[PDB]
Amino acid sequence: SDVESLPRGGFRCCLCHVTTANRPSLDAHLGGRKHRHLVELRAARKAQGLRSVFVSGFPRDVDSAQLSEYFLAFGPVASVVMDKDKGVFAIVEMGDVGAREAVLSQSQHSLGGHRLRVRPREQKEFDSHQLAKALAEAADVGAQMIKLVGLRELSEAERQLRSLVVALMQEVFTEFFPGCVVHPFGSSINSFDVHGCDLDLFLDLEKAEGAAMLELVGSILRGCVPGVYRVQTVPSARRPVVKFCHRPSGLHGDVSLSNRLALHNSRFLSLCSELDGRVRPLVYTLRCWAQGRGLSGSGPLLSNYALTLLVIYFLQTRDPPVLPTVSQLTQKAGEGEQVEVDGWDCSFPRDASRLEPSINVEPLSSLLAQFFSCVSCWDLRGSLLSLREGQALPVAGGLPSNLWEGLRLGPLNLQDPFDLSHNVAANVTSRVAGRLQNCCRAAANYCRSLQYQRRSSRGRDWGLLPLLQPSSPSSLLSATPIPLPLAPFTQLTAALVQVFREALGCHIEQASASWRCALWHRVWQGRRRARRRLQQQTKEGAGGGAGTRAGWLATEAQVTQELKGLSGGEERPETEPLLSFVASVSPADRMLTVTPLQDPQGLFPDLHHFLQVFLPQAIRHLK
Template sequence: MESSEPSDVESLPRGGFRCRLCHVTVANKPSLDDHLRGKKHQRLENLRTVRQTQESRSVFVSGFRKGTPASELSDYFQAYGEVANVVMDKDKGVYAIVELQNEEVLEKVLAEPQHSLGGQRLRVKPREKKDFKYNPPRKQGSAKREQLSPEKLAENLCQADDVDAQMSLMVQLFEFSESERRLRDLLVTLFQEVFLEFFPGSAILPFGSSVNGFDVCGCDLDLFLDLEKTQSFQASAKAPNMTQEGASPEVDTRSEDSILSDIDLASATVPEVLELIATVLRKCVPGVHNVQAVLNARRPVVKFCHKESGLRGDISINNRLALCNTRFLQLCTEADERVRPLVYVVRYWAKQQALAGNPFGGGPLLNNYALTLLVLFFLQTRSPPVLPTVSQLKELSNEEEQTTVDGWDCSFPKDSAQLNPSANKENLCSLLAEFFHVFEDYDFAGCVISLREGQQLPLSSFLSSEADNKLKLGPFNLQDPFELSHNVSANVNEKTALRFQRCCRDAAKYCRSLQYQRKSTKGKIWGLVRLFQPGNPEALATDGFIVNLPLTLAAVPPQSCELLNQAGDMRQLWFQKICTGIAFTLRDVLRCSCLETAQGFEEEQAATRSQQQEEQIEAKMKLLSAGSKRPLENDEGEGVLSPSAKKSRIDTFLPTGESMTWDCSTLHRVWLGRRRVRRQLRGTDLDLTEKAGSLELEAKVSELISKQEGETTPTEPLLQFTVCARVTEAASGKQGTCVRLSFTPVPEQAAAFQEFFHFLQGFLPRMVEQYLVTRA
């Protein structure tokens, strides 16, 4: 700590420290000492020292002619002493920073009353000293991720006029920007130029999401290296006594300089060729790093990363069918403008429900290609159909378009103008609702979905020994439209298939509600925004944000049970203790502002009892005044003015509708990064978990997160919401109670509140139970 300037370290409340040089906050003095001895702090200290030394012996020079070279300035100031460096203004060329060897030379230069160079009078003054500031490098693509965050997406979607407009907006928000398209085109051009040098006649062809019409910002760049002409060229070049008719001198020259002399493409294995491609990428393609050949995949590839943009991609050499699939998807998007919005929405919905994704190394989730085919199949089976089947497309193709790839028939028109417009006029809103309705009870395991025929195919046609297509059957069977032996969802397990059906069922139910079909006039979230919320959208549409606390007497310590029994008002006092635990968790553990808005328990109970008695007396007096006889059950039970004490106490102590409400707000995102901060606390104090319970530990985590977010307290709350606690009977029986918590955020923050609410669903019940055990 002695080597640091005093201004580097700032003391924080409750023993914390902040390093202004590195923008790092630590919890205590030992952690601060470790940080100050660390590589990052030492490196920045050295960098600051070098910068300050340079400033102390440098002069600012201006007034010379534009275009004056740095060497001319250096030669001029050499007359006063040695010059260490000259930095020119590259943008305008009107000033320069001249760094001298030491301060003695600096004093000589400044002592000269007038400097001139090439007939121009120079203005020479000491270099301005600036405070050293460390600007951490920003991660590539962070702005795009922020723009497409769930909160930003919800905010944009809620401003649309209807669901159709929301779905079209999804495409605009997720598709490539012009700059990203240009970047990918430039990379493809760069790869083409490099590979032509090593593999004459080769072609680099993009496929997949980059070009099939369903591009999403940041998706991988999939490339296919076509070496067919290269193999032909190599074979003809090696053939003895070949006349070489038609071969140009350019080709011969390239063959001598190419890498083909080291490998025979006709006999080389796929791993050997891929390793060669990886070598070319590492050594000859500028800006490419993290090159790795993945040889154990279903389609072996070479993965790479573009350093400047962070764009990832892969190159394959035996995936020609992917080119046909890409062109087929392009044709579908060109055939009907409703295809793209529907696919974008279904993909994002499945991702939000944790049903889909492209996990590294596979997994039981549906991939984007499978989801896209599922949407296309749905559009094929509408009445009338939106898209034709693959068999119908084959009939429309001409002789030039008849294509066979790897033994599979891949014939279909290349021009969408050959297709007849669809007679189906359903809008996007109804199509999306019908998609969920169709697949909510679909028998994915009992049939095979075929886009070639546009219908379900029985499993028997694939189980027989004579079947040509040895399709791998499973809980989810979706046949590739061209490679008929490939089940594109073969990785999906039974659990994911059933969960997909359940989520479709929930979504279909929600799509029948007004919250989906109409824009909210009260500023509430609606349409696709509710659909994208993880969990059951229908429950959120009708019940809001709900957390149930199913607490039984077993959760209360024995000493508390004795006190409750002695007091008699067991459920009343129990509810009070639970509410105290809720308020403690929100206020003391999560550092939320939490103000009670309900009446006190005793006052509210007395007022409720008095109102009930008055209503009972008034009703019975009316019966008597009308000449009606008193009901028989009143003769056996209580009279008109019988005291309420004769009623069952459990019904009178907690009447239906009794509740406790809090107005809450939070200034910091205390739900983010808790695991990381918890590790920091445990690392700085090994005995923390032994001497502090869960409540104390979580309170310290929230406190540290609040400190790390900023020095000053925000003037406006990050989130504002109300919490209402009510008691309901437990579904398991009469002996238990269940506290139902309803969270209501302000309308304009409903989308942003989602993330906090999902954290509370698991965190709040655990903390309240801990409070009852340790504090009640």
Template sequence: MEPDPDIQTVPKGFRCKLCDVNIPNEPSLEAHMKGKKHQHLCRLRAKRKAQEENSVYVSGFKPDTSTSELAEYFQQFGPVAEVIVDKERSLYAIVEFAESASTEATLAQLQHCLDGLKLRVKPRERKEFKLASKEKHDRTKPHISLEKLNHELCLTSSVNEQMQKMVEIFQLSENDSKARQLVVQLLQEVLVEFLPDCQIVPFGSSVNTFGSHSCDLDLVLDLENTKAFQNRTRKSEQMGENQSEDGQSEDSILSDIDLATASPAELLELVAAILRKCTPGVHKVQTVSSARLPVVKFSHRQLSLQGDITINNRLAVRNTRFLQLCSGLDSRVRPLVYSVRFWAKQKQIAGNPSGGGPLLNNYALTLLVLFYLQTVSPPVLPSVEQLKNMACEEEECVIDGWDCTFPSQPISVPPSKNTDDLCTLLFGFFTYYSKFDFPGSVVSLRAGCTLPITEFLSRDDETPDTAESSDAARQKTTVRPKLGPVNILDPFELHHNVAGNITERTHKNLRREFCEAEKYCRSLQYQRKSSKGKSWGLVKLFTPRVEGVSSSQDAIEKIPEIIIPFRAAILTQSFRTELSSAAETFRVVWFKKVCSILEVVFNDILKCTPSDQVEISQDQTKAKGDTEEEEVNNNQSLDSSSHQPTAHAGIKRPLSIEEGPSSSSSPQGKRMRLEPSADYPEVAHWNWTQTHPVWAGRRKIRRVLLKTSDETSKPEGGCSSIESRVTQYIIENDSNPKDKLDFQLDALVVGSDECTKAVLKFKETSDPTGHFQDFFHFLDSFLPKMVETLLAKSE
């Protein structure tokens, strides 16, 4: 590969200065340089360089000089591509020519005059092309430093006072609220000139009582009245009214677009154009039409405030009113929400500074807090369905077919009988979610309880919960919610999973942090103020997560085991239907499918063979099961003497041969031991032998084989056929194997009070050459992806 000025050699591989990323090796570097991002930035840099070479900087003209006047003057030197004038004060302009020769001709002329004023013309400033720094625009950092926050919290006398202090420190100040109101008024005045009778309505953190200094200004542009105005205007035009002397309609913008038939993208472009050209102080206007709800993003220069505008998003406004109601129902809600949000941001499981991404957003976190307060005994907050029954007839509300009825004032809701203090509620919050089965459950604030995932697995269409009086609403159907590792239903838009962006990795981190927080809250360091001046209470809880530092949970995960998580989203429709029919025993059915796929992976894809020591008597199995039960229960702090019907991780029972699958489904000499009873965790056991280093050089071999096949390139474990060919290639080129690796695999499904997953425990039984660690390291990344690939195809 020829030297590239963008590529820098570093101790751990390479660094692309253009893309600001690190690359571990040469094959990855080659793939990166051919990738879309690198190629796009190369083209963008070349375009920017050409623009700079073809442009001149102009100043000295009158403030009211238009871009067309500047373009007309500089047209004498060559075709003008674009003229950009400083919108704020009109002090300068950038004139871009279509050809570099025009730039040279302009600079060669010593004097330029326009409207009697001498212009100052010079070459455009050359700037080094680089990506915008994310830290520069990171407004998620609080106005108070972490050190000062810790000091303020340590001055209090209890955790209850610390949580109240969090509200005082982070809530929107009076000046923050006034600044947001000014922007709303500005946008209302500008937009109503072009879109008569429209309304700008704020929603989200700025007005739902949970806002912080750094939150965006979320706005809804309501065009319903504008549509009615347009209809009236067109009727008047047909009658010859409301026209100017030249016969043209006075509302020129509305004459160019039909609001009733225009797409959201067209409406957003219209709003963006108004913001760019006619709104003082507003800059960095950008339309994002690919979002779930398309938005126009903007910034206000003087107020350092960023905002979003969506079109006719009345559900978002109603959600905001719901959060306002919950905040007013109990004084403990706000301190709890503020504390949980800051904790989640410190632990890097929420608050993505660039928006989107695989982290929880503040709305999803808030719903988790509200749901916990609905389920605690006695409940602090009522369910949405209970609130609906407390509303009067005048408060009934249906939006887009969804029933959004609840009381408008907190006084309509009876006060809670729960007397727990904030310290106890925060401890309970972490305890509740540290044992919560996120993949196997759906959080429903409407019902005030968890719904089993099986209720959603077989749904192609879902009828929304609508008011009986609305015929159109009863006919409305929507797709089922997007299922994932974490499922939190919106309180009103019941097909929207507000945590649908969460990945397996984020879910794993979320569960780990819940467990760590629950463990810390059990200590006196959380509950009592330190008499020696040490960190206590929330201060210790808010300690930022440090990468590379192992925790007690991480230490447990170092045991050779691999997790196969339950992911409903990747399953076929027929298997979803089967799981839905299984109801509460869906984990049993899913685990049996996983076990059959594991046999395919090890036997057919990795070409492992059954070990000669697979035959285990029931006595041996029982002894072995008792040993492992004690070991796992010690690790996970479970009661080894408990045999309740609910599933507990690590409990094993002696299995008979008859309880396993038929011998026709398993390779000869190997038996998968499977306990079919739904009252206990499913358990399976295999002994395998691997005689070839199937983990060595797989990626390189795969790249070679893909060049000679019609199969598309996929991540390791993404295609069973190519992986089988890779293994066969390794075996054929390792014709004289010297040593073999024997290992044992025990699998169990964990659910109910744990997150639904299959836990695979590995143990080497014969490893003379010390290859087990390399093999396990390979399986750790390969096996979950391979199982997921086969599950997605399995009928």
């Protein structure tokens, strides 16, 4: 009854959301642990719900204890839970059906001089376009990145909502703990926040006591904080955390216990962000790209903090240093900023008004291209990327292992600037590292394309748009050479240049003969309608003129000029070509290879099919 069919004989489990490819696999799923566990959960939940009662209207600010002991006379209580948000209502779980029947049998209840609302409980079962439009009209790619920052950051209302949530959590925690504060970190304060980002909190006040404190935090969060659900603990890791959600505001996030290192990391990130102007748009763009291409997330992927540290390291290892090394920051931190946590020195200047500006001049487009290229080149497995020194330490030396005693090496090595034994890319497996390298190579060779270099006038998804939309390009390259009519190589190459220049209106530069060709209008389309107009006008004007060898090129040039004039409505300055390509001829077999260079609209296939019909006819009329 929980199985819903699917095409190709598919089967799915509604509970587990797990598909099966055939009947035996479905039966195995139906008879194995995951499914039974879920049917036991649903059966127990439905039974408990049916043997349950709903209480409202009880006197304001009355604890569950007296209500439970009042209901004790009517039957054996099992669980009483009170509302978080306002405590208006409560649910009393009874350890039987008879007592639930007894309590629902009465038409009147009294407790503490207030008529109660005892009532049976119901049981129930378990920017795609606007972003593109906003980024499709900027002046250039740098403006696109700045606008991406503008429309991807946290809006002021969202900031207010997050601050209200933080204040609520602070209030409840101060109610429980004697003296404590909640320091928001991560995206909340490092100025690298996006819409719907994690709300990460630090609770400021050998392992059993830590586990007990984490369990206390989980119990307090589950039982007192209004609107939170899905509280779970990860007590066995480098930093035990408790995860939660928040139904009213829709937020989710993590709570850690004793990491001041996170606070210092966040302040360092803010200092880097306000130390130069390129870093914030660069990190936002790289995070959006990595999220789109499915290599940044949770688990076996680059955490976005690791991506932020990677782009910071890229900014550090340039010949003109865009950002200073953390060693330089530690040296330039004056007296009073010397602090250390867990035996590790975390010192850097507090205000950006003291450090000299970087002498780096190259804009954000060049920085993005250099990031792609340099990250694609690096020997990630054999090199440790040290942020404190801005240097690639040799991983095989053994020194980086015995120096820090806790460094877990791997396919990608990247040490956070303050913890000396916390390579932040230990999650990444080999497949994810290889995918990162390959996608970086793809982006690197895309950045050299003229589409990323010049904005589109007619609208062709220029700028970051291809790097944001997934649009995995699986298109084959030039595989079909065009056969040409047998002519002497010099005559054939001359006649091709005439046909491209005169009959098609291409700009042609000389690059086996080869030429770069560029087109601003769709000269392959419409030609049948243009020729019929020219033929009608000629038949109305002065019939005559026997067709010579020169008359064919002149007639195709006129058919091309008509197709320009029918689109002249455009007034945009024609600085970017609608389609550019190479034309290349082999000496022996006299075949023409044609390859795209810039095709912002995906129109190269239409041009190629047109040239396959047109060029072997043109070279027949030019013999």
